[PDB]
From a paper:
[name] has sequence similarities to the catalytic domains of glutamine amidotransferases, while [name] is similar in sequence to the substrate-binding domains of Mur ligases. Together, these two proteins catalyze the amidation of α-D-isoglutamic acid of cell wall precursor stem peptides in an ATP-dependent reaction. In order to provide insight into the overall organization of this complex and to facilitate an understanding of the amidation mechanism, we have determined the crystal structure of the [name]/[name] complex. We find that the two proteins assemble into a curved, boomerang-shaped structure, with [name] docking to the C-terminal domain of [name].
To obtain insight into interactions of the [name]/[name] complex with ATP, we prepared a ternary complex by soaking crystals with 2.1 mM of [name], an ATP analog. The structure of this complex was solved at 2.14 Å resolution using molecular replacement, and the corresponding electron density allowed us to unambiguously model [name] into a binding site in the middle domain of [name]. The binding site contains the consensus sequence GTNGKT19, with residues K59 stabilizing the β and γ phosphate groups of [name] and T60 coordinating a magnesium ion that is also contacted by the side chain of the conserved [name]-E108 residue. The magnesium ion helps in positioning the [name] β and γ phosphates from the opposite side. The ATP molecule required for catalysis, replaced here by the non-hydrolyzable analog β,γ-imidoadenosine 5′-triphosphate ([name]), is bound at the base of helix αm1 with the adenine moiety bound in a cleft formed next to helix αm1 while the phosphates are contacted by residues from strands βm1 and βm3. The observed binding mode is in excellent agreement with our mutagenesis data, as single or double mutants of nucleotide-binding site residues (T60A, E108A and N267Y) have completely lost their enzymatic activity. Complex formation with an ATP analog revealed a nucleotide-binding site in [name] that is similar to those found in other Mur ligases.
Author numbering:
A (entry chain B): 36 to 193, 198 to 433
B (entry chain A): 1 to 244
Amino acid sequence: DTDVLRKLAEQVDDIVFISGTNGKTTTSNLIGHTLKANNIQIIHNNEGANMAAGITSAFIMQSTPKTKIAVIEIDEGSIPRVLKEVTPSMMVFTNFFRDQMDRFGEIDIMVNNIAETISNKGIKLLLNADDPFVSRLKIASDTIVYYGMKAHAHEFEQESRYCPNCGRLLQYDYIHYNQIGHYHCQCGFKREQAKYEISSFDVAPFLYLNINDEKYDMKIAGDFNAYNALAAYTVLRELGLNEQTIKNGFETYTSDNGRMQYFKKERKEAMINLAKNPAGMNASLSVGEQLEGEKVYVISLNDNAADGRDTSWIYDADFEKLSKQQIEAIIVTGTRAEELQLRLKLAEVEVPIIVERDIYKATAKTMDYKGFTVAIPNYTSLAPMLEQLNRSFE
Amino acid sequence: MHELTIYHFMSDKLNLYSDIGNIIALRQRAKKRNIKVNVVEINETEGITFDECDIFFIGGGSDREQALATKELSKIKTPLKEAIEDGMPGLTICGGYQFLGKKYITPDGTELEGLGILDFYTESKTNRLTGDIVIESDTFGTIVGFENHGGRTYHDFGTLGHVTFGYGNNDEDKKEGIHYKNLLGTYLHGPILPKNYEITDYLLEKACERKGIPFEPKEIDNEAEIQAKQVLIDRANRQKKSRL
Ligand SMILES: Nc1ncnc2c1ncn2[C@@H]1O[C@H](COP(=O)(O)OP(=O)(O)NP(=O)(O)O)[C@@H](O)[C@H]1O
Ligand SMILES: [Mg+2]
Ligand SMILES: [Zn+2]
């Protein structure tokens, strides 16, 4: 079966591996989504099964005569095992973050083992120039492509680092976050110039990227996802895709867990974002400020065991700020919809409140409005609300 | 417009029960009677005086924060008790209510000193009294809330009412909280005040007449409050019918 993978992979022209400690899945999804949005048959372990068996399984179940590109997310610790049977043409690495519970220098050791494993195989390596420990993999191929982010592209929501070439303390001209930044040892190991670079971006509420003098209007959020998008951008370009083809798929990709998850049908738009505590609610209530036009809210408050039976925390949330927004109506739902109605009355939020305790009906009701749906469930409300939203958007 | 002043004691340490919601309920009910409410947060008692106070409020903290709050409040035990004895309106929540009494006994038998304002005690047990609670009061109407406390409080004063669903102060009495003069105390969460507007209006009204300012209009719109109460009333009944 390890010979069957070897046999299956041989008939695939382009095999792209995605690895690193964080962001592999988002990166890999952006790549597979964008190719699929262009009618390119691909093998894609789109479920995150990034170990040898799951990679083997994807190849078995998805390979066809028309499958030109394999897009494979790989657990970094499985790189040696998979390389015995598959050699990729291209490999992108996102980052290498040492966790605080990791033992002494388990990172550089991991990166050496990876560099030794992939060494001298003609693999085109796509490296995060801003991560010193990804950039250390430059020693492992003669075909290196850098991506990175211009200094001051974004103000990220922020221990000490040692050079991976010579081991001396690293000097940084600028820090994006943690170890990600513009560094330069005295040994010569430095932050190299990037072939593809983000000059600036913002999150208002979704990523809006500026890559090599082109603008990408995303439908996912999260600071850190600019890097995953840029990594996916770099794969797609190196596969020969053009700005427009890449832009088409980047503009439609969305998350699927109910966290800043976007929806669209014709001109009607919605966004759903889980909030189950004062800080999560405040952030979900803020999203509407950054959306243009009238908004229609559906907010769900269940009080099941997993939610907690005490709903008093909604008084610690800043529902009063909704008065600064342009809102057609707020539908309150869940087993404790009436606490939400009463909370909003005391918030002096003077828009129509519709009490509809059935989460399904309350959520579908937002389709009756033309404004941007902002949908906010607490924990046990999420699955029914998300399911209705997928129903309503076809 | 008229003003009323709330002394909010130890708002920093005694912060476990979403006190702000009780503050909001008082601000909003008074605002519909054209009364502006100023809240004075009092976390240090040094020569504090009740001359300028219309209603006081003491929230609940953890066992450790309660004892430290009690130690700080004991610096004005006599100005406080004489204010209560003069009819000063007050609301106290969980620990802020329990430490009005003589002592609080933790589950392991540990004995914490209260203010001793009133002659009662509380003794905690590990198995908690938890759930929806529906109370029928002759002063506050139907009081509706959530309870979740290990403390069993034992006093021979008047209470917020009779418990038709839930426990109240302890396992046996089917009576909730304390009502002494204009001082209220309770174990209820929600917080208590937003749904239970007769309690909010009682305190505002007592402070209005003692100050000599009017409380008009007296009857206002309560639909949202009553709809929120009714959820718990209906569910309590269901739990009763489903226990046959
Ligand atoms: N570029 C990034 N930099 C730092 N953190 C990130 C980045 N991308 C994602 N993360 C965080 O990492 C978490 C996991 O993201 P994901 O895309 O699932 O990474 P992954 O590498 O696939 N994880 P795993 O398969 O468990 O090794 C996310 O919830 C983010 O909080
Ligand atoms: Mg993954
Ligand atoms: Zn160096």
